[PDB]
Each structure stands twice: as C-alpha cells, then as structure tokens.
C-alpha cells in the first residue's frame, strides 16, 4: 500500500465517522449527523475542515487497538462563512464513542477558539455529548478546563452562540452557561448534570428524561434556554437568520444592512393601542412589530418571564435590541424572573455596540413573600445595573405607567440615557393618585376635593416633563421616525468612564 | 474595513417548492431585475423592482401583470402569498434542506384550543357565555381581575359553548378550567 | 448612578439598622457587602399591607423582611449582628481588612504570628474513611494569622465557606467547601455566594486561598429546575476571570466538573497543593470500574487494580495538575511563601468593553 | 502497603535518581549530580522542588515497564533564593536515561518558566544532556518547540543565564543561543550539534570531542561561550556572584548595593597610564580596575576578541556595564569579532536598565580582505546600532585616539549620549595628521610647514571640544568621581521614541 | 517595592579553611561588630568596623591589635591576606 492510498482511506473513514449502522440509528432517531448539520449551517462550499487526521493518544484499556482509532476523534471543527461573513464552528459527533469528550477532542475545539479570538470571528457550537470519556480519566477534565478558559476569555470579544441538538451531561453543560445565547431543539435535546438514575438513587422522587432536562423545561421554567425550535433543519435555518443580526467582534459597529422600509413613515396604528382605562391591559407586541423594519422581530424566551419582552430587530438597517414590559401578564410588574432575563440581554447588546430601545409600562414590583424570600431586592438590582452601566445609545419610550422605583430601573433618563419620549397617556409618579392622596391628606376634611385636585394636576405626563425627565411628548404615530432619527445620530457617540479592573454587578 | 465580506458566487438556485400535496422542482437564476425560473421544465421570466418592504409587490411574469402580497415569511421555508385573492401556503426549501428534511420525525401534536383555562390566578368577574352560545375566535369569554387589572380570556376556536365550569364570583387558580368549547 | 459608577473603584459597605422600603432597598444591592441588625432591621419592597391586599396570604413584619430571613434564606444579607453597638464595633474591625481603593494593594498590617511555624493539628483532621465528614473550619482557623477569621453568611449556603483573614499581615480572601453539610456538594445557593465573594476580592487585589473538597453537584429536580447549570457557571467564571494570586489546597475529594469550578490550576492558578488524602478523578472508583469494565469476567480484580492505581493523588500530580504533595502541617508556611512572591504578579488580558458573566 | 508507605518510597527513589552506580560514575568523572549542584547554587534551605512525582506517559518500546519509571523524569526543577532574592532554576539529571529530553521533561521546565515570567524572577539553567529521547519520537521535538517559545518570549522581560556543565547535543544546543549569557566548564562541558561520528561520515576530516565542541573552542574561537570555569564547584561559586549584579526583571532598576568605597576619591594612578608616544600601547584594564568600586571587575569573554573589553562592575553600589577598547591588541582596532561581542553585551544592559560606561581608544578598523570578505560592513553596523538604540545612561570617556567612523560607533555624543569626557591626550579627527595633510595639501610647495601647522592646530582634543563634541576635558585622576556624579543623576532619565512593532537591527 | 528581599536567617557559619597543607574547622557567628569564632576548639573574638573598601583593615583579636591587608579575593574561596608582612594564601 502506497502513502497516497493510505491517505485516501483515512479521508473516507473520517467522513464516515462511527460507521454506517450508527448513522442509521441517528436518522431513525430523527437527527442529522454532525457533518450534515454543518453543510446546512454554512454557505455552500465555504467550509474548511481542520485537523481531520487527529487521533487520540490514549493507549490504556485497549484504546491502543486499531478498532478504536477513529480519525476526527468525535468532533467536526473548521471555519466557513454565512452570507459571506466569516464564522468558526464546531459540531460534536455522537457516532464516535458516544460523542464523549477526550483530551484531543477539547484541543481541536480550543484551537479554533484561539483563531476566532485572534482574527475577531464569532464561534457557533452545535453540542451533543454524553459527557467525559472515562477511559482517559483526568485528561478529559483538563479538556473541560481549557474550553472553559477560552469561553471566559472570549466574552465581550466575540459573540458565542450555542445550539444544543441532543443530550448533554457532565461538565459539557457549563459551556452554554458561558456563551451568550443558548438554543435547543424541542423533544430532541436535553440539558442535565446527572441523569434520572442518579436523582432516584439520591432522593426518593420519580422523574423521566423529558422532565429532568427537556427543552420545554429550560425554555419555560428554569430560564436557561433562550428558544427551542421544532427540529434540526428548522433550528439551523433560524440560526442562520439570527446570525445575520450580530457583529463579528465587539470592535465592530452593529451591522447595517440594505433596507427598503422608509425610515420616515408614520404608524397611525399606534395611536389607539393604549387604552384610556387604567385597568385594561394591552399587548405590547403590537407596538414592537409596528415600529421595527418590515415588521420582523426576533423574540427571545417567548415562554419564560412573559411579563417582559426582549429581542432583536432592525431599524433603518441597523441591528437594535428591544426591551419592554408586557402589561398583558401580571399587570406588567417586575419580578425575579423578568429581572434576570432583562439584565442578561441588555449586557450582551451593550458589549457589542447594539443600541437599546426600551418600551416602559411598569406599575411597580410583584408583591408577596414568594418574591421577598426569593431575593427580589438582589435580583431587581441586576436590571438597574445592566442599564446604568451601558454606554451604547439608549432610547426610551414610556407608553402608560411608570410608578415607583421601577421608573428608574426601566432605563430612565437619569441613568445616562440619550432620549426619552412619552406618549400622551404616560404617567410618571411615586405611586398612583389613590395611595398618594390618602397618605398626603390624612385626617383632613373634604378629602374627595383633594383627590380631584391631585388627579387633575399629577395624573398625566406633565409634572415629569416640566422637570426635564422627558424630552418631548409625542404622538404615537410618529414614534418610529423619531427613534430612527436618534439612532442615526447617536451611533458615533462615545462617553468616558473611570478606570476599573472589572465590573462588580450585584449578582 | 476590518473584515471584508465576499458575496457567494451562486450561479443557480435549486429549490424544492412544496404546495398543497406536491413537491415541485424549480431552478432560478438572477440577471439583475429579472429572474429566469424553470418550473418543472417550463420557462418563466419574472421581472420586478423587488422592493421587499411594500405590502403590494408588482411583478410581470412573461408579460402578464400580477400583484401579489407576502403576508408572512419564516426561516423554515414557510411563506404565505396572496395570489388572486386566495392565500396559498408554500414551503420553499433548498435542494439540500429538502433532501435532509426527509430524516425528520413526522411528529403529531394536539390542537388544544377548545379547552379554556385560567392563565392567571384571581377572581372571575364576568362570563359572557352560557352553554349553547356561539363563540368566535378572539371572542372574550371570561374576565379575571387580579392586581388591579382586568384580564380578558379569549377563545382560540370557533364553536359553541358546551359547559361553563367557573362562574362569576368564583376564585380560580392557575390552570383551572373556565369554559369548554365544542 | 453613583453606586454603579463606584463599583470596582472604591468598596461600598452598607449596614441596615432599621426599616427599609421602596427604592431604598436597591442601594444595598449595588454595594459590595450588606449587613443587618437582628430583630431591629427590615428589608422589603412593599409592606405586609400590600402583600395581604394582593394575594390571600398572611405575613408579619419579621417574616416578610426580617434580618433572620435575609441572612438564612434569601441570601441577601451577609451577616446580622445582635444590636446597634455590636454592629458598629464589628464594622470597624471589618473595615480594617479592605483597601481604600482598587488602585491600592491589599492592606498589610503589623503581625506577630511567625510566618514559618508548623501546624501539626492539620495532619489528622481529614479522615481516611471516605464517608466520614469533618469540619473545614478547623483547617481555616489553624492556618490564618492568630486564628482570627471573619466569616461571611454563616447561616446561608452552609456547604461553602467564604470569608476574610490575614496571613503574614496581608488581607486574603478564603473560599472552601464544607463537607459537614450536604457532603460538600455544590448547589445553586453555594455558587451564588462564592461568585460574589470571589469577584469582590479580585477587583480590589486581595489574594484568594481555596480549600477544595467537593464530590460533585447536588442531584435532583430541585436543582435542575432551578437552573443549576446557569448558576454553577457563575463560580467557574468568577475564578477564571481572576487576575490576583490564587493558591489552592485540595484536602480530600475533587470529582467531576467540580474540580475545575473550584479554582483548578488550569484556570490560570498560581500554585496548587494536594494533601496525601487528595483524590482527583472524573468519578469515584465504583462508578468508573462499572462503566469501563462492562460485561467482562473477574470484575472484582479490575476493581482492586483500579483503586490501587487511581484512588490517590498521583494520576493528577504526574500530569502537572498538582505542584507538590505536602504534609498538612506545612500548609501555612507554604501559602505564606507563595503570597509574599505572587503579590507583584501582573498578567495581560485582551481588551474588552466589559465582562459578560453568564448571570 | 499503605498509601503513606508508597509515597515515602516514591520520595526516596526521586532523590536517588538513576541509581547509586550511575551516581558513582558521575563522581568518578569529576562531576556533581543535579541535586548536589542546586544545593550549592541556592541559599541553604531556600529550595522548593516542584512536580517531583511526575513520570513519563510513553508506553511504547517497553517504556511501560516498571523498571523504566523514574520519578522526576531526568530534571530537577524548582525555585529558591540567592542572598534573599527569588530565582527559578532547573538542572538536567544525566543519570536518568542519559539526561535525554522527553515530552514531560520539557513540560516541567516550561512550567517554571511561566511562573518566572508571571512574577518577574530570573531563570538559571544548568544544562547537561545527550539530546532527544528517541523512544518517544516527535514528543521530544514538541518539547523543544515549547521551550524555545518560552525562551524567546522571556527575552527582555527576565534575564536568562545558562551554565553548561556537561555534554550538549541535538536541539538542546539552541537554548543557550536564546538566553543572555552562556558559561561553560573547562574540559568537562561540550556544545555541538552532531558528534565526531557524523562529522567523519560526512566529510573526510578527523576530529575529537574536545576539538569539535570543547569549552576552549567556544570561549576562544567561535565566540559562543562567555566564560569557562575550572570545575563544577568554582563555576557555581562564580555564578552566585555574577547573579548579584543583575535585576530580577526588566521592570526593575539596576540593583544598588551597600558600598564602602567613597564615591568622591581621586585616582592619581590614571594620569600617567596613557603614553605621549602614539605608537606605544597600554593596557586598558588598568583604567577599568582603578575606576570601579573596590577594584572588582567581572570580565566577559577574556579570551575572545581581545581588542575590545566588556564586563560588569559596580560604581557607588550600582551595577554598570563597561565597554572599552584594548590598544594592547591589534592597536585597538575594530573587526568583525569585536563588533559581535560588543553589540550583544550593550543590548542586554540597555534592556535591563544597566548604565553604560565606554572607554574609547580606537584608531579605525582592521584592514584587509579577511575582514572585507567576512562582511565587516555588515558586522560593524551591529555595534553602531546597539549604542544608537540605547535609552539607558551612557557616559563616554575618550582616552587617546578616535579616528574616522569608529568615533561614532564607539558611543559618541551624537548618538543621544548623556556625557562625554576627554582626557588631555584625546585626539578626535577623520584621520591622522599625516594622511590628512598629504591629501589636503597636494602638489603645493613647503608641505613640511603645512604639516607642522596642521599638527599644532588639530592633533589635540580642541577642534572637537569647541564644537560641542566633548563636554569637558578632565584630568584623569578625577574620572571616577565625575562618572559617579553622572550616574547618580541620570538614573531617573527617561526618553521618548516613536512606536515600533519591533526593532530591525542589521544582523 | 515589587520584590521584597528576605535576609537568610543564618545562625552559624561552618567553614572549612585550608592553609598550607592542613584543613581547619572554623565556626563563626556575627553579633554586630564582633565575630565569635571557634578555631579547632579555641575561642577567639574578632572585633572591627569591617570597612571592606579600605586597603588597611584594623581588627582586634581578643584584645590584640592587628592590621591586615586583603590583597585579592575570589569566588572560589581564595583570599590573599598579608599578615605580619607575609602573604598567606587561604582557601
Ligand atoms: C391592591 O391594593 C394591590 C395593589 C397592587 C398594585 C401593583 S401590584 C405591584 C405594585 N406594587 C404595589 O404596591 N402596587 C403595584
Ligand atoms: C448514590 O448513588 C447517590 C450518589 C450521589 C453521590 C454524590 S451526590 C452529588 C454528586 N453527584 C453524583 O453523581 N455523585 C455525587
Ligand atoms: C599603514 O599605512 C597602515 C595604516 C593602518 C593604520 C590603522 S590600521 C586600521 C585603521 N585603518 C586605517 O586606514 N588606518 C588605521
């Protein structure tokens, strides 16, 4: 056998992976293989695979046998482009040793992370594993340590996107916790530290795989996964479109893309969304959809902390992040869960120079022992900090209510905001007229007259505007045009801040 | 200026276009303002300005003047087009996506739109219905008011009421059944 | 705005000595440490009158926002003191640990405790029996200068210990596991307290000493549904980001991913010592042998062979995971030496607009 | 056997090394072992050994046998102090596998280099090896690559000192080429790439071990080794004293040490060293010894390029570097070899903030085809650059001759010097009076009168001094005091220079 | 200020001092200006100011006034001392 023949056989084996019968199982299971997934993700013909001939060096427990020598060692790594833009990817291959992490496995992933940091290119990981490769022992633990170090170092330098498309257990579960966004695939992906076998052995509780770490749990109740997609093909199609929003590095401005939607059009549909009756809820999403370019909005965590809306959109071609209240759910009140989702989204957009638009309608905080015992004070400070720290353009629109300390938490002008607009129905106060009059006028005669006088003077947007809290009071139909104008002039804005070794968010 | 973008040199677009129950083979190419499209062997030339933001898109197909509206678009290939007044649902995948999509499990889910449950704990203050009442989609059925805020519970299905399970004055929790539709 | 701007520039200490309601409750959430006064201080957003009006639950003032609740169950207050006079006396002594600004080195104060003395009391604290717990605090007290240790949140997340002490006059921060509680396992609550403490000490140039003895993570749906994955990443990040000296001592167990979370050498640590009872592995010998040797004859022989080779500190040390294996009696002197030479250590890191911790 | 018993046996084996019989051979051979050498080098009780229990992981060719498992894997690594000052060391142990380099061998060395860079501590290596461990194959080549990368990265950050105390072959020979100083041991150390067996096989020439790579060759003819010492004990004793001159890092100022030698004393012995007769040579070393503190001078390469003197000394407690001409050899003329030694010494002292004192007495360059064909132009530019680039204090004293382009090469004031003094016998000119008059006055009558007129006006130190080339003309007896004064005021001097990615020395 | 220097805590100096053909055992300790030196069991106290730069070093050895000159010193232990006019080579 010649050298060239050996090489050709090594290429064909790396392409097959764990063997055709294991591929057949993956397809029976409704899953794509690691190499098929890359072909869908990246532009045709743009993918360049690295280190395809790397094999493990473990010789213990029979691992020195030729029957265990799978070139590629369970990961596909390399670089490519999505719509002409450079991206680094890796995808874990479940057909070779179960997708378990070896020393060399982690290495290959680390090397492309080092290039991505060096050139300033994003990294997308497609995760699917069973955990560490116990046959190597502590080399897989060193593998995890090296990946974790890169994931932390890359934070704020390049965006890191993780899509989980299968099981995930052991140390693998912490890389999505270090990246910026985590997505899952409904009823196909799992994310858990230990399996149901350990849970039942430790505590006398019964649980199945879908209940312990299923995609529905992590998108609806734990707040870990940002969005689950129906299947592998739809998940990668939406991932490509999501990719188009983000810059390649934090040194880059928010991407600007060709846009046909005139920036100066009016939106008459906004003038009557907000009811005059204070106890009538409305859907904030109707406002978000009508303002954003071509009515396209990418919603993050649609099923978790529904009282606050966060997501991506484009206005006049430029990527922006949108945060707003949802009065339809829990009167639009802040709670622990909403503060966690908000702070994380805001922090990402600030780090990568993506402007923020805030739609405020918040009557206060959710009362009760469930929130007080949960540390609502500690968690609420997370959203206040996330806005106060921001140095990217911030445009706030107040649609109806902003009572109490929630006014400042939801990116008020006094946290170094750029512009703040009020709609005619906006009301800014420490509390509603009923509470304020009962406290201010206590024991006096003709309280009912005092109630009428207070409402006429303070139950509107004027006592705040005349003080400099609001820059203008605008007709809702003009909101989009007003925001577009601010975005196109604040984009070159820089501010100074004292030197710090690093930030100290309340956590 | 730091990261030059290179436009993919795509000569032909090979698409698998699913309509009602047939999958058609369509190959398109761009020559500026006109797309040369072969639909199962038939040659068509679609010329337009392709302003993608306007609600009304005017196209000329082999000299024939058409107006279409794109009502929705999804990354998964779904596109809703109103053509001659009727909305057609077309799913456009690339050749590669269509060939791999055959490996996806055809899972069947349940349409749970007739069972109307309380989305939020609180007291029921109004019920607009009794058994036998007609219900339209989006119709208000019950009004629950907690935390100084009237929350309307609407129907997700056109039908009639079979039973009203919670009345005005009752206190309900999260997930409790309010009204059952046919 | 000032409380956020000052973060990482000057330390901000808040002591609550009475009621606190409304917007006032968020300033302690922006400062670095929050202390309370037992049965005198309260911290709540709305009073019991609002809670009863919104939801049909009964609660009193001490239950809704009392000092005992915030130091034991919510994890908001770092420590409650008996009364106003004792609270300020302990606050003065706490003050003496901290630098005035992040531009300053950790304070160094006159110390009479010889830096090179041996501590024979350490050699027999850790039992040879793997299912016998011990009190980590006995180790912490015997190492630190003059046996003075300032414990933070003594009644919250008892499975992890964090606090301040001085070694050879220099202020250091100490983090360690407590095997006495929940076998020394990590959970959501322990990760939250750890990450916050570590982050403060790093920002103000206070060295870290870590005492590791962690068998893994607390299993169960209570932790999985609570986002144990998300919260565990907080402690891993807090150590990985640190640029101040980090000295780790492994006393007995370090299994699984918890090895790296508890400030392993592979997160840019400076020194890492093992005691003779240390064992570093992906999992214990029983699980590993049942998985490695599946369906083979004479498994019992394979079990003996595996334990003899891997159930010790050697497969990690021979790979460069551990710098030395030391007699416990010498631990204090070894740490003192490292602190007095790593104090001038600087590292470079790529430019970032700001950090992005998983939250 | 208990765990504690196993540990104790592992400690005793690591201390023994390759076995008592191999130690006996080392002592018969007049060599110390690697551990005995460290005890001599470092302060008593200050040494802390790292990674004493590390073993190789190679399982091929019988390397998995227990008989080959030597803890420590042929190197002693760790840290300590010399006179209270932190230093990192390693010493190669010849008794285990011949001192050959394994993967793990290089690792252990790399780890202490990484600490030394992190804290800012010097590294001293004691080298003795036979080359790569061929049983591992390419892992030892990766070992060399990692060491080489650290040795380059540390340059200009911490000083790196290498003492060769035995044979050295293969890739090992390049680490002393990357460190700052290389020392050897006479008739015990060797430094060669290939042995005499390869040389005789390739070319028809006979050579023995001492001729091919002996210490005498490298200190006298190739210019590779800076100094050879008689034996192992004397080599380490002089190494400790050498260590005391250098800073721990380039961020530190030149060390200052208690000194009893008054800084303001006169040195009458200098006034009559330089003869009035231009063709009478004198020994520059008499001047160097009389100026430096307590007449202690550390001479570098005493037997190579004898026409230029470089070395270390202390003036008023502060470490300084001294460069000067030696008129006793080749009239004090510059050649290829002298330029190479000078540029390297000057470059080190500049990088680590050690002031320079220059004693100039140079009539020009060595003429002839031997120098022209050797690239005298290219090599002479090395010394000119090394001085011109310097940003540390430079004090020059001109004792007698400085003709031609050599004036500027030997650190003239026009290369951003700080002070430049002339003795009464100094003469600065393009060329001597005889050549200049024959060229200037060509074909004229009464040339002899023109010769007398030229000598009276130009054959002295005045035409340069009156132009600003010389700051003062001083009596030699005051030289030491004048230099001490300049050193104590230039020590805080900083200069600005344009940004550069890196220097581009002519090479 | 970056790298604190720690003075070795040396209680006793145990030296092997070679003269002409004999090797002597000498143990010295410092108590400030006076060195307490035991030379093969004999106790001597050497007091001086120990100015190491002067060509003339004045010492007092058990009350006996001596002047010595250090003519050379090497790292290898060689030291040339002129004592009563005669130069002795001690290692
Ligand atoms: C009735 O008195 C309940 C009042 C609750 C109104 C809302 S709920 C959350 C905010 N907190 C508060 O005190 N008022 C707001
Ligand atoms: C019995 O089989 C229960 C085993 C639990 C042991 C501990 S508890 C937490 C760690 N996780 C794990 O799987 N083992 C460790
Ligand atoms: C006799 O004419 C030989 C003259 C050499 C004098 C010296 S040697 C090197 C210098 N170069 C030169 O031209 N003169 C100097």
Numbering used by the authors:
A (entry chain F), D (entry chain D): 33 to 539
B (entry chain E): 547 to 728
C (entry chain L): 181 to 539
E (entry chain C): 547 to 637
Which lines from the publication concern this structure?
Propionyl-CoA carboxylase (PCC) and 3-methylcrotonyl-CoA carboxylase (MCC) are biotin-dependent carboxylases (BDCs) that catalyze the metabolism of odd-chain fatty acids, cholesterol, and specific amino acids. In contrast, PCC and MCC have their BC, CT, and BCCP domains divided into two chains: the α subunits contain the BC and BCCP domains, with an intermediate BC-CT interaction (BT) domain between them, while the β subunits solely consist of the CT domain. In humans, PCC and MCC catalyze the carboxylation of propionyl-CoA and 3-methylcrotonyl-CoA (MC-CoA), respectively. (**A, B**) The side view (left) and top view (right) of human PCC holoenzyme (PCC-apo) (**A**) and MCC holoenzyme (MCC-apo) (**B**). Both holoenzymes are dodecamers consisting of six α subunits and six β subunits.
